[PDB]
Design a protein around this ligand. Sequence first.
Ligand code: F43
Ligand SMILES: C[C@@H](OP(=O)(O)O)[C@H](NC(=O)CCCCCCS)C(=O)O
Ligand SMILES: O=S(=O)(O)CCS
Ligand SMILES: O=S(=O)(O)CCS
Ligand SMILES: [K+]
Lengths: 247, 432, 564, 565
Amino acid sequence: AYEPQYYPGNTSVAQNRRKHMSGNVEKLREISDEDLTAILGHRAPGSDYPSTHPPLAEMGEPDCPIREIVEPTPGAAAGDRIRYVQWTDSMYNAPATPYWRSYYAAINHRGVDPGTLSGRQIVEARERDVEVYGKMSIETEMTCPALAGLRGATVHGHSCRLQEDGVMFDMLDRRRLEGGTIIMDKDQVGVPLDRKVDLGKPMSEEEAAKRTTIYRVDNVPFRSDSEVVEWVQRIWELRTRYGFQPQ
Amino acid sequence: SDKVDIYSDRGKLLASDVDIMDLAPTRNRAIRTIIHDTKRTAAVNLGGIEKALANGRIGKVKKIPGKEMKLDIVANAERLAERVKELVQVNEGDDTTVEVLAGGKFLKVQVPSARLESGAEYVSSITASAAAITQAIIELFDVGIFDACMVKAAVWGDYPQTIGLNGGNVSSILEIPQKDEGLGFTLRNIMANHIAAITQRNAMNAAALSSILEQCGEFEMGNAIGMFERHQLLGLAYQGLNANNIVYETVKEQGKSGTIGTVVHSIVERALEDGVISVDKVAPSGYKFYKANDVMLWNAYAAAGSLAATMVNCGAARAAQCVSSTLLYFNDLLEKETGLPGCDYGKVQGTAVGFSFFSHSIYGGGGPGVFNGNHIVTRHSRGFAIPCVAAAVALDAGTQMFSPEMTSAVVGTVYGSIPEFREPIKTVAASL
Amino acid sequence: DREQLFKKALEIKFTQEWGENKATEVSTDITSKKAKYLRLGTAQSPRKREFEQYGKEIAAKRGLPGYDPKLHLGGIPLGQRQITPYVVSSTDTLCDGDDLHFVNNAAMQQMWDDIRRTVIVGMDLAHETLEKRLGKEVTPETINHYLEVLNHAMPGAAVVQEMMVETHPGLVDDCYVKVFTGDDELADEIDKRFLIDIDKQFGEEKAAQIKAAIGKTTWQAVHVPTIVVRTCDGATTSRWTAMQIGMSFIAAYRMCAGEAAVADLAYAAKHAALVGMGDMLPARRARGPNEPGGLQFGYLADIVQADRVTDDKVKASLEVVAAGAMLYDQIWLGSYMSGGVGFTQYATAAYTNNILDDFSYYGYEYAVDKYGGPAQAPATLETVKDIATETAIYAIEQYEYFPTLLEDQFGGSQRAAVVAAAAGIATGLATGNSQAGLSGWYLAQYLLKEAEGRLGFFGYDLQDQCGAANVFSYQSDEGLPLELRGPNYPNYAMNVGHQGEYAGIASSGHIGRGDAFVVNPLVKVAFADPLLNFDFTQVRKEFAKGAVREFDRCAGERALILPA
Amino acid sequence: DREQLFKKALEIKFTQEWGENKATEVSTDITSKKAKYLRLGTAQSPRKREFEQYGKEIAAKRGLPGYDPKLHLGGIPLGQRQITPYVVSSTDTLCDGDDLHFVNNAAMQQMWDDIRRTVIVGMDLAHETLEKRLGKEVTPETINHYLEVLNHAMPGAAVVQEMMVETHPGLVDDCYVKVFTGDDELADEIDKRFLIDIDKQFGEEKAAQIKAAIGKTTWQAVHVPTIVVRTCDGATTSRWTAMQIGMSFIAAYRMCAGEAAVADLAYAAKHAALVGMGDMLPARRARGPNEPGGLQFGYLADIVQADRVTDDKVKASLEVVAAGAMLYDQIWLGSYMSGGVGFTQYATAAYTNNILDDFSYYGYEYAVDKYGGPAQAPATLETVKDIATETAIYAIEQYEYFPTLLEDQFGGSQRAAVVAAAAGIATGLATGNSQAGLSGWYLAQYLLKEAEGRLGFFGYDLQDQCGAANVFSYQSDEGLPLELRGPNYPNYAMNVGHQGEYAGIASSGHIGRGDAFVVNPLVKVAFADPLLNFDFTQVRKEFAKGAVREFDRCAGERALILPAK
Ligand code: F43
Ligand SMILES: C[C@@H](OP(=O)(O)O)[C@H](NC(=O)CCCCCCS)C(=O)O
Ligand SMILES: O=S(=O)(O)CCS
Ligand SMILES: O=S(=O)(O)CCS
Ligand SMILES: [K+]
């Protein structure tokens, strides 16, 4: 037996980082299957998932011992196209941080291709699998609909000052606070939708500060989580020493 | 079938009735051992490593202040050689050798065959030697984590910022594969100064070692397939290995008062006497146009003649520079004398035209010693030009700035300590 | 309380109107996390309006369109967020970020041309050739005559043949050759018009250190025409130099104009006594010598000359960072290795708004107080851990205390380059060991990642995750002192936000020690020359001049051969 | 009696005063072996006086001297012999030889920049990636929108990110992308502003030949900014092109701005569907792609476009020679591989005074009369021996009938390049085989050597003595059709007076046959574009414009970002 520990630290930030890593995240809002498909912009809502169409020479399944013992995901078994879910998260205590959305995906979802950047975080996977991931990425506490936004392009905003209404700037205006709720009426690449998708209320400033995986000097300073600073120094020192002589 | 008698650097019979196929790089055991040792042997310049460490210097001009580590290296050459052998060898008692030379300044390292057999190229001779000496010095002086990078720089130079060990202290008779002009040029990228230093300035052995390496290069290039195998082997035997004593006896006959032109006349007289050429037709003026009864054998006589003329002309002046003009005018005058193409059907003469230009102008090149079979100036002939350059460099009595004593002290000492490299004609003949 | 050095710049660039961005309506408080988004687009920016206007003229003239702000994704032009200017660090120049794009900045192009068009060629082996082969005497009189001939010939003018056609001197007036020597007796006899006087250019201690490293050797600092390297490439420089050195020796010493000894002078100038700016690159990113990829970090530190004229150690190291961030990220990675809009702001993060200055002065001042002074801290992992952690966490917190600072350096790679450069430079200056500084850079990168839950762009930290292990490795393609690393060091060959900062770290150990040079004393002396078009003692001031279209030493233009 | 085409130019350049050279006192007879040497030096030449005066200003401003005519060996300045001008062949422009130095001629620099800054990139594999991998539809509408986006982005302008800083369009207005296709149905649907119409640019027969070679494929003719290749190098071009193609596909097809499929578009633009101007060079003369050394002789023939607009076969071949002699000898061998005063007149010999024109028209007219017409002479050594000997001996004798011709082409390498180019081009045009032309070039070289008892400079004939044997060799580093040879072909890698002439010979077989292109139909179509700064249909006319400082399409200047004058 083995009980995963995930990450060091004892502050609310470290506790939230372990929640995102372990998948122990609270559900705070609901999105319908068709509204999720509409905002991802890969196919018409309600339509069946299209398949890949590879050349004749690649249709044959090879005799492979690994293919025989690794079960394909539902998306891989159906031959879905590879599609994506990309998020931008404010540095003003958006619950999510790019590395921790990638750790959440790597630990809790099969057959995923996560990518971490400062202003965007992506997960590519077989379309139906990426929608299962996408639903959890938007319904859970990993998202605040004001401090975060699905953006497959023109991502600028993670490090910008918030708007006067507390919403993170979006050059393409895909979602905004409209009459007491967050409305997303364009897909993740800015194409206007023929519907309004209601992403619900934003988190309060206090809730975001309590649920965030980002450290901030005016909330939970990075300097205050001694075990995390120690862990960094330990990895740096051991990598340095073993690079010279691995003993 | 083509047969030859192989004669020594002193014109003495060494082997009779030798099939030229048995002298091929692909069949001759001595040539295969020379190439095997060329690929597995590297030189570690302990003297260079010592000065680089003591002064924080990398190559000729780079110096990082505050990095001086005045480690005592040269005086510890035998202890370091023992540790380098332990690190370079694959198994105890295998074919690895490490020898101290030049009073501790150099190590000759011969990596075991196993490193070449599991590698694609010869470069493990450099990398295993460089890694071995770096580790041995770190151990002997208990060099700490912060300072080991300066031991690394003292051995490997600017690598990996540079493609090779630029400014380092581990080298070979060969240059890195990335410097090859095309496919099969590695054994052609060897300075004529290296050959002359290795063969102790014995002009016949300098031409022989160069001809062996050049023809190994021509074979690896794909220029000795089908009918071209006979073509290149006749050139190797007659120009490189003194077949039928033509090179030595022509030089002896023309040594006292001969010139480039009298060597041309001697070669035409000999080709006619041996039945290699005959009169084709006589012009109204009486000028005789000759025909080649055996084109490849005529080419080989012109290759032998090109070398004999170099020895007579450069030998008389005791000056290497005459080789570029000798290769040009021996072949130009040979064509004017007979109406037949010169060596390599104009390519020795053509190589000599550019070689003369690039050894007497502002644009590049240098003295004869810097040229090689991979040099853009001298690559054009199919291995028939550089053997003459190696002989010419050997015959120089002190006219050159960039002499073998200036450019080839390390290689000359390391590879010159191996008998097969010093005496290639004798070694080739004895392996038959 | 220490007043952060960037606050003045943040007040100017965010709270004072620039163009028609209505800055006072966006926010007047540099600590406010909120701002009023006016979405002014093109209308707020005279610079974007200039580009839009030229785009209309171009489309009309060619019948094929070009620049059009409305072709931005969704038909929404740049400037939905407030467009702000930049203060070039250490200057009072305020400019648009477009004015710092290498294409739009003649000072930046001229800085690269002055490096590209330079090689250093020894004279000793050439003089020895003349003595050995011709029995010629070399004296200060023959050398001075040779230098007059050389400065006529080098730009492309004839000295031997009849009926030669020549370059227009007005197109090549940036081309010249100066000399320097470690032989003080020879230096006192060289014609002062051509001499780089080591005693005048460097302080007593540094001049002695240079002379001891150079010995009694003599060198030519050659600068071929900018128009030639622009028409051709960096690999042209050593060949162009050798051709005119060869002609000048022929004419000045009355040699035969093409004899065997001339080939020895050619081999000496092109190979044996040549000291270029960098060697070739491998097949995938193939280039010949004298290209940015071959320029070792220590060479860029020796090209820059701020340390020669200022005792402010942090300032001198950051002038190296500015030259390197521009050359390596904007020109090299942003054009030679990629292109398009490129990487202006990945580099400007390291030379604007006094931000890297604030972080570096903080770390260095902390180290001076704790360890005593420059080059006094032990070169150990304990010292690196202390200085780099202190400096990195201070820098991390500044982006959180100042939302305007975070919005200015909006990309994580910009924050990573600046946070880690300050940690590395403070560590290098304090220990006098640039390898200790490099170790500090990687520790700072790791701290930033865990602090913000993000680091740089997708591929930013390939070299940083490889980094800690490869600082002190002695393995074949891993080990190397930082001074000799460069853009061809495998881990460093692809990514922005590292190379220029590494040039500053390479300089830091040496600046901490008060060394005259970092890796090549010949390079240091060759660039200690006020006649060079770019002023290498004041890199940031020169970039600021180029930004406002006031840099007046741009070479290589063809106005003289074009219609009026 | 046939009137030699160079006589009018010799009369003008030698017997009519140029500057203050007192030409009528030197000699008024172009056939006279004697001349009165006045030793006027600098005073005769307004151009040398201009250089002298700039030299004094430079010395005064810098405190470090420069140009000084009196630093010529012995204190004797250039011009002890009469300084004469040159007529640019096929033009009425008379200029100083210094006006044809590449440094002093903006048309020459712009010709090289237009080649250096160009690559051709296929669209089919990118469109297939969009359809198969992303399930996106590619239509003429999406392509046309992509091309508008691409022409905004390519010069250095943003399309996805916020707060981007961009290149000044006024500095990069020479940058654009056009397209061409062998799919006629698609050609009729592409936005005409971006199309290179193959039917309009080429005759009916040539357009059909191009379309059959290209097939139903579509290509982008990309021209990155001149200022970029001048600041950087030719190896920048394919990378700059791919970056902005990638951004334009992301924006025009609304892809994720950085997903796995984007890497397939990058690999297609940079590698699988890239058609550059030339590959890299080996270590000794190391350079990346798109440098003159990598430019195959057939590529230079396909870049030049005179054959597309004139039916005069010799004239079309000699426009190729002019482009090649300038690029390969003046810029490439004379600067990239050497430098200094360089090799202006080694190249001008092939494009001045209608001399090469006289010799080539003579040889070609001889071959047309004897064999019937272009591409009708058998491609045999008998034909090569006949045409090349007839042309070479005629050319050799012209230097002896006209002492002014011999004084004009004073260097033996100049005589060798022109005598052999005429023999090679006449042979190539007559046989329709450029390899037969190459064989003729080497025979002419050998005839000239025995005729004058001299050939070229010290190292001129390395490739010519190697030459005859290597024309038809099939050995590893010897064999290759001339169209695929270039400045990196081993024998050719070092010497002046051959490469540009070989580009003309490479063109000659194909011009003789009436072929639309020589070696790459994509290159031929990409340069059949009047929007390019250099007019590739009239090479010599463009060089003449540059010589008199009237070339008005020079790109890459920085006047807009420099203080006002
Ligand atoms: C399409 C890519 C993927 C790729 O391969 N390159 C891109 C785009 C490319 C283009 C954008 C030009 C344009 O807008 O048309 C250029 C300028 C390169 C070019 N072709 O000239 C560039 N990036 Ni990018 N790129 C940058 C950056 C960034 C930051 C921006 C995050 C933010 O919050 O704004 C993120 C990476 C990250 O998250 O860490 C980023 C991503 C991306 N970068 C995403 C687009 C993101 C988006 O959809 O908005 N870049 C930076 O972090 C700052 C410097 C900036 C570069 C331009 C400059 O230096 O001035 C530019 C460097
Ligand atoms: C030979 C070689 O020079 P090195 O021998 O390598 O110095 C070569 N130069 C050249 O080929 C010069 C060609 C141009 C000048 C001569 C024109 S005939 C080069 O620089 O790579
Ligand atoms: O988004 S990516 O990190 O791939 C490129 C940033 S410039
Ligand atoms: O005299 S040489 O043939 O070496 C050079 C002529 S440019
Ligand atoms: K250039």
